[PDB]
Amino acid sequence: WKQGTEAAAVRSGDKVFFAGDSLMQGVAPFVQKSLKQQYGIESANLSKQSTGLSYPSFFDWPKTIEETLKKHPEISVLAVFLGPNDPWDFPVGKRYLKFASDEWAQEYLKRVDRILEAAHTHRVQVVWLGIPYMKKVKLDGQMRYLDKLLSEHLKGKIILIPTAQTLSGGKGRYTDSVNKPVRYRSKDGIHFTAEGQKLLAEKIMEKIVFEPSTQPSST
């Protein structure tokens, strides 16, 4: 199944499902409010602190997504935002994979593909946010690696929303504030202010298209 790669269509009765870690936790509530007030569309926000794809033993996002779509066939959009808890070695069965090795990357993308397969089998449109720049230098290098690993794999398959340049006003590197200076990033150099969360929520809404009952038109 081939979803749209530019935007996701929603109809009355659809739900939007938000997944990820604390990057998503602060953003999703703004999107949920906008979906409800603009379109009457309900949502489920399952984002959870400290989670990711590297350690399903802590919280299994692919399994959670499979089970949630089974319980809620009315979900038509899955939005995903994660990354900072994942730049670690991790075990797979009897293997122990080292961060950013070829085998690590292959298994990480297999987990990504499991999420895409679960969504696409059920005609659910996936939206995935790019990872922001980070204040800390080593983490930023890890996140730039992971963001490129994900984006190279996901481009042309799903809807991607880059965030790094947007949150830094195009500077190409981490900034706390963006021009009147406005602070988008929280104090830990990872998460967002309310203004940063609202900006990213607006970027998500740009990729969600409400379809009235008289669309599409007949020919």
TrEMBL record:
Coiled coil (UniProt feature): none
Regions that span the bilayer: none
GO MF annotations, alphabetized: phosphatidylcholine lysophospholipase activity
Descriptive protein name: Periplasmic protein
Taxonomic lineage from the root: Bacteria, Pseudomonadati, Pseudomonadota, Betaproteobacteria, Neisseriales
Residues of the full protein shown: 104 to 325 of 327
